[PDB]
Amino acid sequence: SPTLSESHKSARNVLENIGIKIYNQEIKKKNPYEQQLKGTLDGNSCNLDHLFGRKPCYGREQNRFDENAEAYCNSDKIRGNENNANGAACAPPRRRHICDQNLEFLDNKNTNTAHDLLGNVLVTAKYEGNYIVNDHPDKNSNGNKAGICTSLARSFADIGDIVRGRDMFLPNKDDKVQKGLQVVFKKIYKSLTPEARKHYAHGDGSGNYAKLREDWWTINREQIWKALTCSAPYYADYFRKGSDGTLHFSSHGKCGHNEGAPPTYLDYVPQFLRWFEEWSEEFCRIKKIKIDKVKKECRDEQNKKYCSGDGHDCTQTNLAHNQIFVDLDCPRCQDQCIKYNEWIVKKLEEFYKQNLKYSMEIQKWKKTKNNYYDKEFYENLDKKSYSTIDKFLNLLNNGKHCHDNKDEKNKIDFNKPIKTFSISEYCKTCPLYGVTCTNRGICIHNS
Ligand code: PRO
Ligand SMILES: [Mg+2]
């Protein structure tokens, strides 16, 4: 079972465990004004009227999970990414095409209360969840589709960052979702009782919109998770492990849709860390798909096919005597190897960029005297071994998709980029003295 065997030291598990502590600190202090921010309105029913302008997925590209769906690591669309810095956060394709379109229509005479905003956010969650569930790579698995619940937790976390104004992705120069949200949140603040207005106020009397949006999220996150999981398959639950290996899980399917408190705390994990963890999992998952396509064009021992990356037929090639034989099937190995190497080269660059950004986020924590929303989280990473990039890279190695390689040669190790981002073994130059393939269906190295 990949679900049950996932390391208690996977980045997802370690980050979720710090996320729990952050969430706990945040809900420790009583907020007397909670109710003023409280909003009142395989797969199953998604009617919002039963269990509680424009639509959410319009204009958005689908195929978010395709092997060639690209991450965005450049500067114009990411806050904090600049052309003068190699260090960069990578917005995953799941984020890039998120179903947030309805939130671009919040600046209107109708959207004025916490209930009006919740309505819109539940509509976003329902649709985003519907897309994830209906296009997920595990949609047709015969096991409990835990993988879908994980992708939903990742979108739930991005939605929370959009709602809170912490999200780093800038879809275009207009920033309509954010501008709409700041208008709705100004109305909500004005609509509060004077005593609540002072609780959400800076020293100078001006509105503390950052704190107001944080508490709004915290207060409504449970209903938002319920909407997000409306279409979640019945036989799908969220699973996570504690530091001691204790298994934590939703109990009634649909990723905890019917259970109240969300089973996830990813919405309390810094966005950059969540994106890098998804980058690594999706890299390892996609790499397996790409290696298999390279193998079908390069090596088929049973059918006497043994090619090299140079398109040589290893069954008729002897590099030691300088005897090269290029048949008509092996040039296709060359073409698949060229294509695989371009993807690997692009992933290596994305990897170094996030590697640098990680160091920068850790350094920002060490040097920052003043407070910020991500400070306590980075304090906790430091308390554990994770101030070292090497210790954080071990967590990426431990991921569900990344750790799953029983073969010693092709084991994922982010601390050894040369081995992790190398050419496929099926692309290596012919063994020196050639290969002999028997009728048995196995090819042996000559001499
Ligand atoms: O991101 C960059 O290019 C440099 C190197 C690490 C800190 N800033
Ligand atoms: Mg930028």
Coordinates of all heavy atoms in Angstrom, one line a residue, residues 84-87 356 360, ligand 1:
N84 N 16.5 39.7 -11.1 CA 17.9 39.9 -10.4 C 18.2 38.8 -9.4 O 19.3 38.9 -8.7 CB 18.1 41.3 -9.9 CG 17.1 41.7 -8.8 OD1 16.4 40.9 -8.2 ND2 17.0 43.0 -8.5
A85 N 17.4 37.7 -9.3 CA 17.7 36.6 -8.4 C 17.4 35.3 -9.1 O 16.4 35.1 -9.7 CB 16.9 36.8 -7.1
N86 N 18.4 34.4 -8.9 CA 18.3 33.0 -9.4 C 17.3 32.2 -8.5 O 16.5 31.4 -9.0 CB 19.6 32.3 -9.5 CG 20.5 32.8 -10.5 OD1 20.2 32.8 -11.7 ND2 21.6 33.4 -10.1
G87 N 17.3 32.5 -7.2 CA 16.4 31.8 -6.2 C 14.9 32.2 -6.6 O 14.6 33.3 -6.8
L356 N 17.7 27.4 -3.9 CA 18.2 28.7 -3.5 C 17.1 29.5 -2.7 O 17.4 30.1 -1.7 CB 18.6 29.6 -4.8 CG 19.9 29.2 -5.5 CD1 19.9 29.7 -6.9 CD2 21.1 29.6 -4.7
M360 N 17.2 31.2 1.1 CA 16.8 32.5 1.3 C 15.6 32.7 2.3 O 15.7 33.6 3.1 CB 16.3 33.1 -0.1 CG 17.5 33.4 -1.0 SD 16.9 33.6 -2.7 CE 16.3 35.2 -2.7
Ligands
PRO1 O1 18.9 34.1 -5.7 C1 20.0 34.5 -6.0 O2 20.4 34.5 -7.2 C2 21.1 34.8 -4.9 C3 21.8 33.6 -4.4 C4 21.1 33.2 -3.1 C5 20.6 34.5 -2.5 N1 20.4 35.4 -3.7

